[PDB]
Amino acid sequence: MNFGSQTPTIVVLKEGTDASQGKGQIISNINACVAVQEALKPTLGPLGSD
Amino acid sequence: KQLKEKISNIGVDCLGYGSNDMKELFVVDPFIGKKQQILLATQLCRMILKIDNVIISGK
């Protein structure tokens, strides 16, 4: 009845598509913005740096 | 010497003459040329000192 020896299961998303649940991703997104924020932290002000 | 006397045309004699007074040595420079040495230097170094983050993308 079957076409061959075995039949591997289908991944729902495409192979290599990154996905994650829970509170870890939104913390990573916030930490990503804070990482960009730290570059512009000492730039703010008249005595800031280029 | 320059603190004592007010005459301000005495400098470093490089050719080895016996007198350092430049009235006799025939040397003259422009004011716009000597001014730009200080202006372009002091205005650049402000930019050099204001750099904190230095990112260099390797070719």
Side-chain angles (χ1 to χ4, degrees), chain B residues 29-44:
Chain B
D29 306 316
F31 177 77
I32 196 73
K34 196 73 175 175
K35 186 171 70 173
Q36 286 281 18
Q37 292 183 346
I38 290 155
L39 299 180
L40 299 173
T42 193
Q43 292 290 122
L44 189 70

Side-chain angles (χ1 to χ4, degrees), chain B:
Chain B
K1 190 176 179 295
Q2 196 69 242
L3 185 62
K4 187 175 181 181
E5 298 181 0
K6 296 180 179 179
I7 292 157
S8 63
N9 53 24
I10 301 98
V12 177
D13 179 70
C14 304
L15 298 171
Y17 286 95
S19 180
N20 60 0
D21 187 11
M22 291 186 173
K23 278 286 114 180
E24 299 181 0
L25 306 178
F26 307 98
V27 62
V28 176
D29 306 316
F31 177 77
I32 196 73
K34 196 73 175 175
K35 186 171 70 173
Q36 286 281 18
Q37 292 183 346
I38 290 155
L39 299 180
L40 299 173
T42 193
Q43 292 290 122
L44 189 70
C45 80
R46 196 209 310 287
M47 195 173 67
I48 304 300
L49 290 165
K50 285 170 72 64
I51 301 301
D52 203 332
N53 299 21
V54 175
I55 291 154
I56 293 131
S57 180
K59 189 172 182 177

Side-chain angles (χ1 to χ4, degrees), chain A residues 25-38:
Chain A
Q25 192 67 26
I26 196 175
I27 292 161
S28 300
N29 296 14
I30 290 156
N31 294 329
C33 292
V34 170
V36 175
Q37 193 181 6
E38 288 287 1

Side-chain angles (χ1 to χ4, degrees), chain A residues 9-40:
Chain A
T9 190
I10 293 157
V11 187
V12 176
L13 279 294
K14 195 173 183 180
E15 190 175 3
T17 301
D18 187 11
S20 180
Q21 297 293 124
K23 295 146 282 296
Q25 192 67 26
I26 196 175
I27 292 161
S28 300
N29 296 14
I30 290 156
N31 294 329
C33 292
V34 170
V36 175
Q37 193 181 6
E38 288 287 1
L40 302 172

